[PDB]
Amino acid sequence: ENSAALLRRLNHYCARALEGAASLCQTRAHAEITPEHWLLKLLEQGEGDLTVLGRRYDWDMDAIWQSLLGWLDNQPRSVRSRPQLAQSLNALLKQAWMVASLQGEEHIRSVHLLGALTENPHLVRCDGLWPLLTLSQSQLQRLSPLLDAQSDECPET
């Protein structure tokens, strides 16, 4: 794969969202970090690629956000320790890296996770994520100039 090597390939935005997802799992306890735990924090955070795509395609960001929170509520609780990465998140991490690397990128942004999730809609279980799965990666590839113009996932200068 491998798990630790994939994480260092994440950009600042996605890494912060996963850290915040890990913090939440630790408090909710919450055995593993699922893509939904991460997607929740990605939306929660900013005007990231998902927020920009959400706007230009008009997604009920409230419903998605609400749907995610409701799913995370039906997540088995055990002991408030420190969490593992779910098989679904581990697989998403590998597919998103495959999407990012092929595009000549150095880091994985939320649109690469969306590109991975688009050809792998089974990695997510939460029903309210269907607007995220309406896009194709040929489409998301074309939308790159728009994403650099409005998203916090912005490289520098």
Partner: peptide, 14 residues
């Protein structure tokens, strides 16, 4: 070698 990648790593690889 980010100050922030380490903070993420703090959490459970197994």
């Amino acid at each position: 070698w980010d100050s922030v990648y380490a903070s993420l790593f703090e959490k459970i690889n197994l």
